[PDB]
Amino acid sequence: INDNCNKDNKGNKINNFWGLALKNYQVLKIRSILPQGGNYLSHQLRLFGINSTSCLKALELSQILMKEVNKDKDRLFLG
Amino acid sequence: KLGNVTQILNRVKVLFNGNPNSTWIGNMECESLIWSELNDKSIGLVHCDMEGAIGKSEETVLHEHYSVIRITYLIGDDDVVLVSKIIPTITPNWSRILYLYKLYWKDVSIISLKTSNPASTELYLISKDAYCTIMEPSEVVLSKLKRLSLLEENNLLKWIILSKKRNNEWLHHEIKEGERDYGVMRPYHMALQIFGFQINLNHLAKEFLSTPDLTNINNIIQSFQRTIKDVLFEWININKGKLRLLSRRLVLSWISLSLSTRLLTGRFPDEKFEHRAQTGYVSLADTDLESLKLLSKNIIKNYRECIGSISYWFLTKEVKILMKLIGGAKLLGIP
Numbered sequence: 001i002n003d004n005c006n007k008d009n010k011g012n013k014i015n016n017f018w019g020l021a022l023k024n025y026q027v028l029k030i031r032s033i034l035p036q037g038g039n040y041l042s043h044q045l046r047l048f049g050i051n052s053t054s055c056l057k058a059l060e061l062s063q064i065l066m067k068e069v070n071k072d073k074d075r076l077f078l079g
Numbered sequence: 080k081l082g083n084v085t086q087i088l089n090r091v092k093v094l095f096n097g098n099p100n101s102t103w104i105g106n107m108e109c110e111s112l113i114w115s116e117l118n119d120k121s122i123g124l125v126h127c128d129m130e131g132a133i134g135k136s137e138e139t140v141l142h143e144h145y146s147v148i149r150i151t152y153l154i155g156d157d158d159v160v161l162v163s164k165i166i167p168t169i170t171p172n173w174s175r176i177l178y179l180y181k182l183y184w185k186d187v188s189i190i191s192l193k194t195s196n197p198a199s200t201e202l203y204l205i206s207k208d209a210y211c212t213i214m215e216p217s218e219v220v221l222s223k224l225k226r227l228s229l230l231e232e233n234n235l236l237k238w239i240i241l242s243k244k245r246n247n248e249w250l251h252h253e254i255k256e257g258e259r260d261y262g263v264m265r266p267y268h269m270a271l272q273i274f275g276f277q278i279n280l281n282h283l284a285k286e287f288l289s290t291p292d293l294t295n296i297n298n299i300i301q302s303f304q305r306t307i308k309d310v311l312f313e314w315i316n317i318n319k320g321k322l323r324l325l326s327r328r329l330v331l332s333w334i335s336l337s338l339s340t341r342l343l344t345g346r347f348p349d350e351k352f353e354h355r356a357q358t359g360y361v362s363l364a365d366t367d368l369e370s371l372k373l374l375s376k377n378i379i380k381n382y383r384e385c386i387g388s389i390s391y392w393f394l395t396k397e398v399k400i401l402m403k404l405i406g407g408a409k410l411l412g413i414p
Contacts, residue, residue, distance in 0.1 A: 002273075003084050009273050018267040020194065026242055028189050030181050033234055034243050039198040040399055041247075041357060044254055044406025048268060048276035053403065055276060056194040059267055061162070064190070064205065065124065069160045073123035076113075076154070078104060078147060079130065 017063045027064075080275040104129075104146045105139070110153070117154040124160040125151045131166045137175070141221055144176055148183050149214050160207055167200040167239070174227035177235075180204055182224075183211050191239065197246035200239070257410050264410065280407035287400050288335040293408075296339045300374060306332040307375065311382040330361050330391045338404060342412045348372075356405055359398050364388035 046053035081087075094112055095101070101108040104127075127147045131140070144163065151161050161184070167173050180187050184206035195201050215223075226232075257265065284293050290302075310325045341347045349367050365383045368375060393401065 002081060006273055009270060013266070013270065016266075018270045019265060020267055022190070022193070025238075025245060026191050026193065028235075028238060030177065030187050030189065031185070033231060033238070034198055034200055034240070035247060036198065039357065040196065040402045041198070041254070042194070042196045042250055043399055043402040044409065045194065045250075045265075046403055047278060047280065047407045047410065048271040050277060050279045050282055053279070055271065056267065057192055059270065060192055060194045061190075061203065065160070065162070068205075068207065070123045070158060073121050076117070076122050076125050078125065078127040078150075 018059060020060050021063065022060070080277065104143045104150075110146065110150055113150055114153050121156045122154060122159070124162060125155060126162045128164050131164065137168075137170070137172070138221065141176055141179065141224070142217055144179065145217055145220060148179075152209065152211075152214055158207075159209075160205060163204045163206075165202050165204060167202065172226055174232060174235075175224045178224055178227055179220075180206060184208060185210055191242040191246065193246040193249055195246075197243050197250055202239075254406075254409070259414060261414060268410075278407070278411070280404065280411060283400055283404050283407075284335070284338065287397075287404070288331055288338070290335045290339075293335070293339050293342055296343055299336055299339050303332045303336050304375065307379060307383075311379065311386075314386065315382065326389055326391055329389075330363060333363050334361060334401065334404075338408050342408045345413045353405065356398075356401055360390055360392045361401075362388060362390040 043053070046056060049055050083089075094109075094116055096112060098108070100106055101112050103109060125147065129140075129143060144165075147163065148161070151159060155161075165176060177189075186208040187204055187206045190203045190205065192201070192203060253265075281293070284290055290299060293299075306328060310329050313321070313325060337347055337349065337352055347353065348371055352361075355362055365380060365387060368383060369380060
């Protein structure tokens with residue numbers, strides 16, 4: 001049932017990517033072409049990570065990756 | 080958490096021969112090991128999430144990025160996607176990395192994530208197509224690189240500022256609307272729960288505030304009472320280390336009490352607590368103790384008047400932990 005639910009969710013959220021779809025102002029191409037000190041206000045949304053909470057960004061980039069990466073080849077992770 | 084239904088544990092391989100220096104990217108041993116282990120198979124994407132310390136100089140960062148590019152050339156076949164993370168710096172000579180990526184990859188996309196911190200210069204580069212033929216030594220390539228044109232520099236800086244402002248506004252809107260909502264979580268949080276991640280509110284509370292549970296408000300009340308009476312008794316009994324330790328204990332007790340009452344009732348007992356946490360410190364005075372619903376007695380307040388008010392400064396790790404705790408209390412409780 002857990003695998004079925006995972007498959008259902010990942011096949012259902014194709015149109016809208018979990019309320020995190022990127023707009024046209026966030027992606028740029030080099031060929032085509034901070035505010036107040038240091039504030040950690042973005043960490044209120046990081047509530048599902050114990051060792052490393054940086055698992056929300058992978059969910060955000062997953063749309064672009066599954067758009068343009070092959071799914072039948074292995075992957076390599078550095079650092 | 081999933082009970083190994085997807086067999087994720089069995090399909091993770093580690094590149095390691097036993098010798099520690101075969102792991103950092105800037106060494107030749109790591110490249111040799113990766114080439115030896117992966118030259119006979121095809122991989123799709125190379126994800127390089129370096130830590131990017133402020134201590135490291137620009138030369139080291141460019142060296143690591145060149146090493147990652149060379150590794151991708153060596154082992155990566157066609158239709159390979161290189162995902163990397165960069166941290167631009169206010170030092171004017173910072174576009175050498177962008178020139179390097181342009182030189183080695185024709186199709187490079189720069190992305191400013193909205194989930195990441197909108198107050199730090201963090202960007203993600205996705206490179207797809209490659210055209211170079213000969214990978215020259217690191218020294219000559221590093222000496223070859225030059226900065227970018229001023230027009231492009233200003234255009235990129237303006238775009239970065241605009242994207243950061245938009246991301247900050249979106250983050251504030253999401254925080255406010257999540258606090259407003261009654262009892263439902265955002266779709267990405269539910270997706271993370273379905274994938275198998277675990278809520279860290281109880282864990283962070285346990286190993287930062289030393290409170291086994293946050294819903295047992297009464298026990299926290301008596302614990303805070305004992306803590307305040309003990310700290311005042313020791314302070315009037317009498318050096319710097321003991322004062323710092325007891326101040327830390329008192330601040331931790333107050334933070335635990337505030338977290339518990341916000342989680343249960345639905346409102347913090349100090350409207351300035353959120354702003355003080357955001358700027359990165361916690362202040363405890365006699366005024367808010369008096370304004371607090373009567374739990375301590377007059378003698379405790381009079382003894383507190385000897386100290387009056389204290390302000391404790393957290394560092395980056397404690398600020399992150401406290402900020403996550405506040406976010407969890409906001410988004411996992413009644414409005």
